[PDB]
Amino acid sequence: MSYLLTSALLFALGVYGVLTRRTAILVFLSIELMLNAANLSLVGFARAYGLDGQVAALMVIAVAAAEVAVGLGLIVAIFRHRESTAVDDLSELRG
Template sequence: MLAEAIFFSAVLFTIGVIGVLTRRNAIIIFMCVELMLNAVNLSFVAFARAYGVAGQIFVFFVMTVAAAEAAVGLAIIIALFRHKQTVNLQNINLLRG
């Protein structure tokens, strides 16, 4: 049971990483980051079955912080959209690099 959950969370995390690295739309990248965070939550909950409540508490912190991060992140995406009329990172290149 534990091994399956850990494997599943590793797969989810990898999908998230691949999404971040290959997609160019800021909102989709952000969704992929959220997927990575949820993969982490899954491992925490799985490990918490073996070790007790600490892992579950950690998950609550992660969810709360992810919500705060989403609020700030979407605000930043909107701020950028007002300037550029796009959220595609390929068209956003004022800064070299």
């Protein structure tokens, strides 16, 4: 229980990260922290409901990895020759 609240606080912290971070990689990082908050909550509740939540959290980790591969791949691809990685440098597409 004491942990669950820390999980929520962490997720919030990650949200703050995403909203605050100026560069792509670091926004992505803040997202990773959020994911981890979720994982911790999954562990606590697994400890309440019996272990399926651990397998869950592990699958979650795997998934996270996959999207890290693709996401960093994208970040590198788009910004390789291009200059500074600040994500607001791409504002061409306007509503």
